């Protein structure tokens, strides 16, 4: 059994030839193991997602997506804070990272946010983020 660090580094390795579902799923499994796991997972995801290396970021978005699909209040709540949402907003915003982020990564972020507004309506700050992105013209 490895740290969240080691697991995320496997699951998002630029050298991976395809999605590493063993390491992705094991990351989701492990983040709930102790009390502070989920906030750590979200810290680690946010950094990976801001990678200038597209495949590193795309894999990390797939991790995010996968863990969000499964039951877990603490992780749902961490992702549903601006402390994490803001890291996503920076990737799609031209005033932060948006100008040198591929449209693939940016569109994926927008697609996921929408999906959470529908699938997790209790995380109201995700909807607030998404409505801001519409008002500012990022969506679309």
């Amino acid at each position: 059994p490895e740290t969240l660090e080691a697991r995320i580094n496997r699951a998002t390795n630029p050298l991976n030839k395809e999605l590493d579902w063993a390491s992705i799923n094991g990351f989701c499994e492990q983040l709930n193991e102790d009390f502070e796991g989920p906030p750590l997972a979200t810290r680690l995801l946010a950094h990976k997602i801001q990678s200038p290396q597209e495949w590193e970021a795309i894999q990390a978005l797939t991790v995010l997506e996968t863990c969000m699909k499964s039951c877990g209040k603490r992780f749902h709540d961490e992702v549903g804070k601006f402390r994490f949402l803001n890291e996503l907003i920076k990737v799609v915003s031209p005033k932060y990272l948006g100008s040198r982020t591929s449209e693939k990564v940016k569109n994926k972020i927008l697609e996921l946010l929408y999906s959470w507004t529908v699938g997790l309506p209790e995380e109201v700050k995700i909807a607030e983020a998404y409505q801001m992105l519409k008002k500012q013209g990022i969506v679309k």
Partner: peptide, 9 residues
């Protein structure tokens, strides 16, 4: 939350 303010894109 204790959360931070939303950044505007």
């Amino acid at each position: 939350s204790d959360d931070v303010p939303m950044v505007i894109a």
